[PDB]
Design an enzyme around this catalytic site. Structure first.
Site, PDB file in Angstrom:
ATOM      1  N   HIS A   1      35.745  33.182  48.004  1.00 50.08           N
ATOM      2  CA  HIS A   1      34.749  32.490  47.198  1.00 50.08           C
ATOM      3  C   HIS A   1      35.603  31.466  46.469  1.00 50.08           C
ATOM      4  O   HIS A   1      36.825  31.626  46.406  1.00 50.08           O
ATOM      5  CB  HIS A   1      34.092  33.420  46.173  1.00 50.08           C
ATOM      6  CG  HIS A   1      32.965  34.240  46.724  1.00 50.08           C
ATOM      7  ND1 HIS A   1      33.162  35.314  47.564  1.00 50.08           N
ATOM      8  CD2 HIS A   1      31.626  34.145  46.541  1.00 50.08           C
ATOM      9  CE1 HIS A   1      31.994  35.849  47.873  1.00 50.08           C
ATOM     10  NE2 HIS A   1      31.045  35.158  47.265  1.00 50.08           N
TER      11      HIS A   1
ATOM     12  N   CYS B   1      33.626  37.968  38.281  1.00 50.13           N
ATOM     13  CA  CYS B   1      32.596  38.614  39.094  1.00 50.13           C
ATOM     14  C   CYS B   1      31.773  39.687  38.382  1.00 50.13           C
ATOM     15  O   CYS B   1      30.596  39.889  38.703  1.00 50.13           O
ATOM     16  CB  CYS B   1      33.239  39.244  40.337  1.00 50.13           C
ATOM     17  SG  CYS B   1      34.440  38.192  41.188  1.00 50.13           S
TER      18      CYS B   1
END
Length: 275
Positions: free
Chosen positions: A166, A267
């Site tokens: 990511h 996250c």
């Protein structure tokens, strides 16, 4: 109104099922769920007990192994909350609960419903001046377009992301106009693209370990610059770099277990500034 100011933090308890059923970019060592739970509790402790943010703790759902990673299901900028459409279809079941929590915080809600658009919050880097969206296996052009249309007050640029990564697997904001960035070929390629596309050059904090480039920056009342970073035990060569931020309140936070399922610092939370 300073960059990084937050009043609330939305998090979600990890289910026991995470250990075996959570998605993971690479096969690795067995996850110690008990340890992961302890590390998550410490993480939440820093955000709420230590820093004073009001923490909204969503309940774990054993059928949603990855539900602890709330950053991927929503992107918040000022008073607007974008409810994303995760690249991994099964994770789209995590969205409704976050949406309800954000509505309760009185945020303007925009839902990504386009069946041809996907986007993980983890591929979004908001610098305080603009947005950078990683085009990866999880986030596509359409998702990026919808985000740009959702936050019209900011410019949005995309950047290629490879493998099962990511955008924030190797970068994150370390302070006002300060981007923490890894040293790998990939990390550096991405950084150069972001620098070239922006109307303004950013300062950078380069660390030897890409994963350690993912930290949490917060501007807290009566404290100022605050930064949660990976520990010396996890990444000693990277911790040494963060130690050079003499005006930041450095707080070492471990994520050794959740890292096995690609769960980094940013996250595990969604940060909101509710005035």
């Amino acid at each position: 109104a300073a960059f990084g100011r937050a009043t609330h933090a939305v998090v979600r308890a990890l289910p026991e099922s995470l250990g075996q059923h959570a998605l993971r970019s690479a096969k690795g060592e067995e996850v110690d769920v008990a340890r992961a739970e302890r590390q998550h509790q410490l993480y939440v402790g820093v955000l709420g007990s230590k820093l004073g943010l009001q923490v909204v703790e969503l309940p774990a759902d054993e059928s949603l192994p990855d539900c602890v990673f709330v950053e991927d299901v929503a992107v918040v900028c000022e008073e607007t909350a974008l409810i994303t459409r995760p690249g991994a279809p099964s994770r789209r079941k995590e969205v409704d609960m976050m949406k309800e929590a954000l509505e309760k915080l009185q945020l303007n809600i925009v839902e990504m419903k386009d069946e041809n658009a996907t986007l993980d919050g983890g591929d979004v880097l908001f610098t305080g001046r603009e947005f950078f969206v990683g085009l990866s296996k999880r986030t596509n052009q359409r998702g990026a377009e919808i985000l740009a249309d959702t936050f019209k007050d900011y410019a949005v640029s995309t950047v290629p992301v490879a493998d099962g990564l990511h955008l924030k697997s190797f970068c994150s904001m370390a302070g006002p106009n300060l981007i923490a960035i890894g040293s790998s070929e990939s990390a550096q390629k991405a950084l150069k693209i972001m620098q070239q596309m922006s109307d303004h050059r950013y300062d950078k904090l380069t660390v030897p370990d890409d994963i350690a480039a993912n930290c949490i920056y917060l501007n807290i009342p009566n404290k100022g610059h605050v930064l949660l970073h990976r520990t010396p035990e996890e990444y000693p060569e990277s911790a040494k770099v963060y130690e050079k931020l003499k005006d930041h309140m450095l707080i070492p936070v471990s994520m050794s277990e959740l890292e096995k399922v690609d769960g980094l610092l940013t996250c595990c939370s969604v940060l909101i500034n509710k005035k």
